[PDB]
Design a protein around this nucleic acid. Structure first.
Lengths: 271, 77, 149, 46, 217
RNA sequence: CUUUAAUGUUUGAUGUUCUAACGUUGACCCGUAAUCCGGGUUGCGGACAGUGUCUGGUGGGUAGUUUGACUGGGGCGGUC
RNA sequence: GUUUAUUAAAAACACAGCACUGUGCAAACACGAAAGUGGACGUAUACGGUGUGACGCCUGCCCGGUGCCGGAAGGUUAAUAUCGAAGCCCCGGUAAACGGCGGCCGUAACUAUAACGGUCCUAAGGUAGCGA
RNA sequence: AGGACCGAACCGACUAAUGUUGAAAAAUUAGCGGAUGACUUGUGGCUGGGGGUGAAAGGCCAAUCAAACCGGGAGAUAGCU
């Protein structure tokens, strides 16, 4: 939860932080762990492609999946754990299958909670099913769009979507946006959501914070020498010119849509 | 590639052109697509990359005549 | 291109109708399916002699295919012949689900919109009882005895 | 301040190693060029 | 003329010039628009919101500045445009070039009419300012402020001297100020002092003109 | 002939549904106790999409260059 | 904090915070004729872009409903030279509209400033910041 | 605890001074800044020229950089000395 830094320095004057004491402190489960990778973000032919990405800290990936499987004989929540692999918190479950696996891990958890990936469902908050057996108006997260592809939409803190209708084949849901989109008739998404609805108030706070967050300066184009990249500006820092990007035409308050294949699922556009 | 395997293709030399009649060059891609032909003579598909002049050409002569060649052109069936 | 049909009857074109057709229908539906053979001023001569045999001797247990076809285009009264449609009414256990094989239109079907049954259905004679779903997870049924001769 | 001359046998050699220069047609078009020009050091990494 | 007051129709095709014919090429029509300049004390620029401000068109506004006649800016066939208009920015790019006048934007159609009154009105207001009764006194008095405030330029360690302005006509307002030599000012300071006058006494009208004569040095 | 039907038509649009090209960064089986690929099965999309040609609009982002001369220094101006 | 290595250390550049936009994953976007790759083993509390520059303090004005404002083309109100244009709907445009963010009059005690209404407009109405 | 204070190492270079055919293709001499992090550094490795890269100066990219270096085109071309 929230904790405010007491100022003893500027450089600790606007550091807003949120502690995580309801997780263990120390190593986690290595046999479900895997390396990180850093490449400054850089391309196949390593290049600065999408600027600013890279650095950070070190961090580590964790071998995971949210396809709610080995459905069989249910699990229970063993612990939750922080990981910098999401803006949330993930959690180990232990199955009665005698399986051991991590899950994305919703808000409602308090350890030892009952889990079943069984399609009958105990309609338990945080539990998954394919949306064709949902309740009407249900709140769901881990929206896929091909059946069993594995969620790829809505797997962040407090992200969810409300089911608007399920009529005939296909289910229309409201993306967090105010976007109505229809995913398929079977397709999953997990009841409710994962919280961490407070790390919104967590800050970088300073450059040191941003340095361990791998944010390498978003370097202001606009007061550069326009020669190698243009936009506005000059040596005189003058205005009263035709503002466009290097593609010769504006990018700020211009639509885009290069996916003439997903209009068909879209009912009412994003905001 | 970008070649018919029959008709004989590859992009071939160009230029944008203007009544100005400026100088630049650009090549020119044919209209080929890999289309899933049904051999029938072993009753399988041997999907080949083919022109769209060629698509016609294959048809007019028939499957195993394009596919008579390839072997006679010493190349992947 | 152009073909002489092999097809007995077909919804346009029938019974050794030599006609030209769309290229995109002809090469990927009229052939290779047996519903046509390419035409050439060579082929037509071969074919003309051949069809007094072929579009008769083949085309005589095929009357079934045009009839049964309706039943699989809807999938409301899922009916095909396993051996039948040319032997009187569709009878025996033989037909659809007793091997769990029935032809689909395009794999999008209403003939496996639920699965639940312990040894399938069909087990009468002189008619053939199909199960005609009333839901997608309850099988309260409305079984019919359609035939498609 | 430092100087343009930096040390290392290692780095020197795997800037251009003989084989690596025998292993890309263009800087082998070169190898041959010089070789025909008759220079008994070649690589300069003996 | 209707209501005695003169209207012109101009350019070459698309204008809905389909007339008796007379401009074999792109040229002759231009001979006409230059007539359109001669006759004005007001010019109206129609621009579209969906083909307006073309390259030729922005040059056309630049030209207008030469034309020395009052600019009133019309946008016609503007009831069919999209609800989020494209077009504030289109107004902004022309605004920044920039035309100190009074605008006044019109969004009409010839196939509806909305702007119809507002166009009639705008021209009159623009004409009053343009045609304003002027007068050596006013000009001299506001001028003093300007030069005191921001400094007449110095040239070759010798400071210049301004000493009166008078009006050489008013209809497109011209003034001729007798000070130091032509090159002793840059065109810019001329314009600075001009812009000042354009500011301190309203000119919703046309650009105003400034001159400099020498005799004292 | 202007004009106007009635009729023969001829053809293109929209509308809807389909599947069989085609797509499938769904799921599985398989060469192969290989995140590549290939083939096959099935699920989903679907005559679309996308691309090739042709073709209209846009395009200082990129490209080649153009911007006189007279001149009591030039540019200024004015002038040819 | 960072920086013009081999003139110039800053007020420059950066920066948290803030603001705005664009993007629903086969993402935007970016590189790479493309294949592929990066973006991301991520997933709108984000991601990308852009932009402003701690912090505190200076009040940032929604067009839909219905109304209003200008205008014509119509509607509506007219004569009934029918057509019906003027004022109003509508078309556009309009929230210093109802309703949250001014005056002026009475009134929170030197009247006067005024939370309520009247009055200018179918303006909330000096509440914030700040006072000779 | 901390982009915490002072301050060696190590890195950086604000004042001055000196050198300026040096001792030195930017050091020395003498004060001086930061110094547990937006740190510092090794080793190795990788981003390549109309190109990178760039906490951005039109910097820097092999002593060279408002267009590398090198080869060729090319005895360029030059109403000019």
């Amino acid at each position: 939860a929230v904790v405010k830094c007491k100022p003893t320095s500027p450089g600790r004057r606007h550091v807003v932080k949120v502690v995580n004491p309801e997780l263990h402190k120390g190593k986690p489960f290595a046999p479900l762990l895997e390396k990180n990778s850093k490449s400054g973000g850089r391309n196949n032919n390593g290049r600065i492609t999408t600027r600013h990405i890279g650095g950070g800290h070190k961090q580590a990936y964790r071998i995971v999946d949210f396809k709610r499987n080995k459905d069989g004989i249910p699990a229970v929540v063993e612990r939750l754990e922080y990981d910098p692999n999401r803006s949330a918190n993930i959690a180990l479950v232990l199955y009665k299958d005698g399986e051991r696996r991590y899950i994305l891990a919703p808000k409602g958890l308090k350890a030892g909670d009952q889990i079943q990936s069984g399609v009958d469902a105990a309609i338990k908050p945080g539990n998954t099913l394919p949306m064709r057996n949902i309740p009407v108006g249900s709140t769901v997260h881990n929206v896929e769009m091909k059946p069993g592809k594995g969620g790829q939409l809505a797997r962040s803190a407090g992200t969810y979507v409300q089911i608007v209708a399920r009529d005939g084949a296909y289910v229309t849901l409201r993306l967090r946006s105010g976007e109505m989109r229809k995913v398929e008739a079977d397709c999953r998404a997990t009841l409710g959501e994962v919280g961490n609805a407070e790390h919104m108030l967590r800050v970088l706070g300073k450059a040191g914070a941003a340095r361990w967050r791998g944010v390498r300066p978003t370097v202001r184009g606009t007061a550069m020498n326009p020669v190698d990249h243009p936009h506005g500006g000059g040596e005189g820092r003058n205005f009263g010119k035709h503002p466009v990007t290097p593609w010769g035409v504006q990018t700020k308050g211009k639509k885009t849509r290069s996916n003439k294949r997903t209009d068909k699922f879209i009912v009412r556009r994003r905001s | 590639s970008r070649v018919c395997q029959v008709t004989g293709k590859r992009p071939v030399t160009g230029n944008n052109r203007s009544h100005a009649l400026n100088a630049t060059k650009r090549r020119f891609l044919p209209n080929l697509h890999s289309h899933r032909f049904w051999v029938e003579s072993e009753k399988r598909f041997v999907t080949l990359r083919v022109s769209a002049k060629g698509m016609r050409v294959i048809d007019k002569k028939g499957i195993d005549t394009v596919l008579a060649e390839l072997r006679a052109r010493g190349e992947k069936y | 291109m152009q073909v002489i049909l092999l097809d007995k009857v077909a919804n346009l074109g029938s019974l050794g109708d030599q006609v030209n057709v769309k290229a995109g229908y002809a090469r990927n539906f009229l052939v290779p399916q047996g519903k046509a053979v390419p035409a050439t001023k060579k082929n037509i001569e071969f074919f003309e002699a051949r069809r007094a045999e072929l579009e008769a001797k083949l085309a005589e247990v095929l009357a079934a295919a045009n009839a049964r076809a309706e039943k699989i285009n809807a999938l409301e009264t899922v009916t095909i012949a396993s051996k039948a449609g040319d032997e009187g009414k569709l009878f025996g256990s033989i037909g659809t689900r007793d091997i769990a094989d029935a032809v689909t239109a395009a794999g999008v079907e209403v003939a496996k919109s639920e699965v639940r049954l312990p040894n399938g259905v069909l087990r009468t004679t002189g008619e053939h009882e199909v199960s005609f779903q009333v839901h997608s997870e309850v099988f309260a049924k409305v079984i019919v005895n359609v035939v498609a001769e | 301040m430092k100087r343009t001359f930096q040390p290392s046998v290692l780095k020197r050699n795997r800037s251009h190693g003989f084989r690596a220069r025998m292993a890309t047609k263009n800087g082998r078009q070169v190898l041959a060029r010089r070789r025909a020009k008759g220079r008994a050091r070649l690589t300069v990494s003996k | 003329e209707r209501d005695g007051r003169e209207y012109v129709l101009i350019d070459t095709a698309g204008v809905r010039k389909r007339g008796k014919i007379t401009d074999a090429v792109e040229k002759f029509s231009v001979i006409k628009t230059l007539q359109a300049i001669e006759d004005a004390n007001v010019v109206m620029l129609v621009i579209d919101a969906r083909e307006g401000i073309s390259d030729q068109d922005l040059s056309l506004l630049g030209f207008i500045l030469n034309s020395g006649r009052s600019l009133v800016i019309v946008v016609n066939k503007w009831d069919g445009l999209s609800q989020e208009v494209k077009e504030q920015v289109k107004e902004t790019l022309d605004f920044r070039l920039g035309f100190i006048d009074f605008a006044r934007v019109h969004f009409i159609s010839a196939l509806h009419g909305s702007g119809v009154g507002n166009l009639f009105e705008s021209v009159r207001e623009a004409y009053d300012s343009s045609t304003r009764r002027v007068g050596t006194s006013m000009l001299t008095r506001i001028m003093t402020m300007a030069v005191e405030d921001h400094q007449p330029p110095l040239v070759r360690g010798r400071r210049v001297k301004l000493k009166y302005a008078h009006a050489g006509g008013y209809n497109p307002p011209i003034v001729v100020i007798h000070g130091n030599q032509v090159k002793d000012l840059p065109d810019s300071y001329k314009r600075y002092l001009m812009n000042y006058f354009r500011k301190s006494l309203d000119v919703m009208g046309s650009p105003i003109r400034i001159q400099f004569k020498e005799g004292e040095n």
